[PDB]
Amino acid sequence: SSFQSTVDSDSKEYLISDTGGQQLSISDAFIKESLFNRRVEEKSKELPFTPLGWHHNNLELLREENGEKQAMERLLSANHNHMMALLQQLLHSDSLSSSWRDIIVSLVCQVVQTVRPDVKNQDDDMDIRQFVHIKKIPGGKKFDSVVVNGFVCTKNIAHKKMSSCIKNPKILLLKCSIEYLYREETKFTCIDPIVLQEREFLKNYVQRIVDVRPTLVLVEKTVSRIAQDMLLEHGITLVINVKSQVLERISRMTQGDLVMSMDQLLTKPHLGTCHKFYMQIFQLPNEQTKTLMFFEGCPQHLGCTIKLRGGSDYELARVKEILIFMICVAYHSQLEISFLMDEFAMPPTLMQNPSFHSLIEGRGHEGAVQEQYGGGSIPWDPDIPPESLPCDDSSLLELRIVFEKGEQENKNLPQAVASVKHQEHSTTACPAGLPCAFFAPVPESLLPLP
Amino acid sequence: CRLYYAGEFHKMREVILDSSEEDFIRSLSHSSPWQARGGKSGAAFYATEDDRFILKQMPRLEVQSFLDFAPHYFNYITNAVQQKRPTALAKILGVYRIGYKNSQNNTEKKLDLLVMENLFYGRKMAQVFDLKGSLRNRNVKTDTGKESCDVVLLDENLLKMVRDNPLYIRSHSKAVLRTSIHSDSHFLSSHLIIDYSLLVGRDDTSNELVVGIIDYIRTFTWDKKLEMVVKSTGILGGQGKMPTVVSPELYRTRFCEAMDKYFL
């Protein structure tokens, strides 16, 4: 219908509800996935209840979730398209960042080339649009920007006499406090010996701290400055009212956990790590002249941020606008590891990436032996691209099978030329909000069929 | 003959209908109306020659009900009805009572009739549906369908036959319909009216859909139309229950919700 018409941009209750829902998790065409999910949840819905009372929940929508993981990862593997470059050089317009964004774009590309996460599972994760901030200082004239692969704040050390600059720091991060915490028997009497019990809390914790040997010490919750003394005398520097966001952020970038009742951690894996904390000072009136702390070599390199400048407000935020134009083109180009050969020339071997990979390897179950048996029935849904384009001109099962054979030279059928072409230059292919269209379905789909 | 609330109807005709009085008269008066077999009844069902207007026969109770609702109905009209803001609700052109001693009519007998627009038009309707939205019961028509002619398909039939019901209405249009549905059902709910269904007519190709709420006059009647005939068995379905049935407010929500699925 309008979903087989999917070599072009030119376009179940709960299902389509969630359809719109994730459709503005990321914006794209509704009907394509409406109809795909229609058909495939139709076979599903035929599984569970009215007849056949199947065990319809485990091990099959499991298989779809796996299908969608492979979908994201591999379909983002096949760009050869005469990519945006012309589109983007054309995107140049719309503001006064002339002559001096190019660094910006080249090096945002660098940092977003830093990124190929494989974090949560057997999954090449991509937390794109989630994992960095860049920042300026309004002052002077802009063009002096200098990048650093790490954080830089204005969050002064817990004690200006603590580390003027730290290196290879391990730290201990806990959403809770260094202050005698909520023991079962809530009791408060004899102020002095109970502040002393707080002192002992602090100090045996400090035993266990230096047993961990942090380098910086940071709580989300609180501390008693007693412990602050206990470690600044040890030299384990400290930070204050410490922001939970980058806490979890970099603790995860580290190996440092946040073991929350360290009576738990009789051992290490709570300690974080990074490379070095280093200040830099400014000196002039008009209190832009501040001091700000480099925090570099964080245990994950998938993160950067820059010294930027500017002598105004409105053109500066307008350069921010170019920077978010770059935000958008970045993650757009990113859903593909930036395009795919259109006119069903990459997509045959794409839908078949499962096919030929898990066939030649075999080593094939990654789909399934039902992707052998049931893989004749439904992954045929991934086999829609051909069922869209070829059967119009050339070949229904034929290029499908003989091109999951693995030529690796992916020109394909000439619907509208009879000889050679691809929609790429024909400028006729739905842009790439459409990919995520396959990874949202099963999480929301496995419950409504209880 | 007796005409009820001549002034109000006249206003209704022009207002919502924007129907010229002369046109109205011509349709009814000029050519004899053609009869349509109605339901099992017993009550006459007619249509004008032009098929623009439908003349139905109503019971004394229903006619009285009409009078009670007329002020609200009128108000609803002003806020929104066909010329005003289009309402799915039936457009009542006129209500009359004919009882004539003369031989043609039964003597000392009262025949009450309601004239209204006809949702389908004269031209043609390929498929028809009567959607209650109610939980399974008479959600199918056995005898109907017998006619090679247009069958009045019911909810279950819509669900199975015109399953994955193809009614695709534009997104812009969906919003307008649903909004109007919500208001109508709310209006009906206020009145305690129930057991009304949505009549749907379909044209094929770039399709044209015809829809409107019908079976408006029936309210507060717990005891009515006891079921007849034997129920088919072999399948779980309607229960011996329920002494406790769905209320008017409940009916309204279900109606809209069900209708929501019908059009995409």
The pair of structure tokens assigned to B10 is 């006249």
User: Is-contact A437 A338, C-beta < 8 A?
Assistant: no
Cβ neighbours of B264 in A, within 8 Å? 16
A38 contact B CB<8A = yes
Pairing of strands B127-131, B152-154: parallel
- The string over A135-164, giving b where at least 16 C-beta atoms fall within 10 Å of a residue's C-beta and e elsewhere, is ebbebeebeebebbbbbbeebebbbeebbe
Residues composing chain A: 450
Distance CA A146, CA A248 (A): 27
B36: Cα separation from own chain's centroid: 15
State the Cα–Cα distance between residues A188 and B136, nearest whole angstrom.
Answer: 66
* Partner-chain residue, chosen from B164, B260, B261, that has the shortest CB–CB distance to A38: B164
Residue tagged 């077999």 (tokens): B37
CB A371 within 8 A of CB A359: no
Q: A151-277 architecture in CATH?
A: 3-Layer(bba) Sandwich (3.50)
Residue bearing tokens 């028509």: B141
For residue A34, give the chain B residue with the closest CA: B264
Ramachandran region, residue A207 (left: φ > 0; alpha: ψ -120 to 50; beta: rest)? alpha
Alpha helices by DSSP H, B13-140 = 21-30, 60-79
Distance CA A219, CA A238 (A): 9
Identify the CATH number of the domain defined by range A85-149+301-335. Answer: 3.30.260.10
| Chain B partners within 8 Å of A12 (Cβ) | 164
Would you say B96 and B42 are in contact if contact means Cβ atoms under 8 Å apart?
Answer: no
b/e sequence B168-178, b meaning 16+ C-beta within 10 Å: ebeeeeeeebe
- Hunting for tokens 């069929």 — which residue is that? A449
Alpha-carbon gap: B25 to the closest alpha carbon of chain A (Å): 46
- Residues of chain B neighbouring A38 (CB-CB closer than 8 A): 164
SS3 B247: coil
Tokens of A169: 């720091």
- Whether B260 sits inside 8 A of A13 (CB atoms) is yes
**CA–CA separation, A350 and A328 (whole Å):** 25
Is A151-277 the same fold as A85-149+301-335? no
Burial class (CB in 10 A: 0-12, 13-18, 19+), A196: exposed
CA A320 to chain centre: 21
Q: Name beta bridge partners: A138.
A: A310
H/E/C letters for each residue in B115-126?
A: EEECCCCCCCCC
Q: Residue A305: beta bridge partners?
A: A148
Which chain B residue lies closest to A42 (C-alpha atoms)?
Answer: B164
Can you tell me the distance from the alpha carbon of A41 to that of A39, in angstroms, rounded to the nearest whole number? Answer: 6
**Angstrom distance (rounded) from CA A361 to CA A311:** 59
Task: Tokens 């005698």: give the residue.
Answer: A180
Question: For A287, how many CA atoms within 13 A lie in the half-sphere containing its CB?
Answer: 0
- Of residues A280, A275, A274, A286, the one with CA closest to residue A307: A280
Whether A231 contacts A217, CB under 8 Å = yes
Is the peptide bond preceding residue B242 cis, with omega within 30 degrees of 0? yes
Residue B13 CA from chain centroid, whole number: 18
Instruction: Say which DSSP state B168 is in.
Output: -
Nearest C-alpha in A relative to B262 = A13
Domains of chain B, CATH where assigned: 2-117 (3.30.800.10), 127-262 (3.30.810.10)
**Residue A119: φ, ψ to 5°:** -85, -60
Nearest CA in chain B to A39: B164
Query: d(Cα A229, Cα A236) in Å, to the nearest integer?
Result: 10
> Is-contact A145 A97, C-beta < 8 A?
no
SS (H, E, C) chain A: CCCCCCCCCCCCHHHHHHHHHHHCCCCCCHHHHHHHHHHHHHHHHHCCCCCCCCCCCCCCHHHHHHHHHHHHHHHCCCCCCCCCHHHHHHHCCCCCCCCCCHHHHHHHHHHCCCCCCCCCCCCCCCCCCCCCCCCCEEECCCCCCEEECEEEECCCCCCCCCCCEEECCCEEEECCCECCCCCCCCCCCCHHHHHHHHHHHHHHHHHHHHHHCCCEEEECCCECHHHHHHHHCCCCEEECCCCHHHHHHHHHHCCCCCCCCCCCCCCCCCECCCCEEEEEECCCCCCCCCEEEEEECCCCCCCCEEECEECCCHHHHHHHHHHHHHHHHHHHHHHCCCCCCCCCCHHHHHHHHHHHHHHHCCCCCCCCCCCCCHHHCCCCCCCHHHHHCHHHHCCCCHHHHHHCCCCCCCCCCCCCCCCCCCHHHHCCCCCCCCHHHHCCHHHHHCCCCC
List B197's β-bridge partners, or say none.
Answer: B214
Q: Which helix (H) or strand (E) holds B54?
A: strand B53-58
Give the separation between CA A226 and CA A195, rounded to whole angstroms. 10
CB B110 within 8 A of CB B60: yes
Distance between CA atoms of residues A15 and B236, nearest Å: 27
Tell me the Cα Rg of chain A. Answer: 28
Tokens describing residue A85: 């470059």
Q: Tell which residue, B47, B164, B201, B181, has the closest CA to residue B116.
A: B47
Nearest to B261 among A13, A38, A42 (CB): A13
Cα(A190)–Cα(B191) distance, integer angstroms: 72
Min Cα–Cα distance to chain B from A13, Å: 7
Element (H, E) at B144: none
Taking Cα atoms as reference points, which of A39, A42, A44, A41 lies closest to residue A2?
A39
- Three-state secondary structure call for residue B95: strand
Give the residue from chain B lying closest to A16, CA to CA: B264
Residue type, A24: L
Q: Which residues are bridge partners to B106 per DSSP?
A: none
Best of B159, B235, B264 to disrupt the A interface (most A CBs within 10 Å) is B264
A218 bridge partner residues? A173, A239
CA distance B132 to B196: 7
What is the rounded distance in angstroms from the CA atom of residue A294 to the CA atom of residue A376? 56
CA–CA distance, A154 with A224 (Å, rounded to integer): 23
B199 neighbors B211 (Cβ within 8 angstroms): yes
Q: Does A411 touch chain B (CB under 8 A)?
A: no
Query: Residue ranges of the domains in chain A?
Result: 13-83+341-445, 85-149+301-335, 151-277
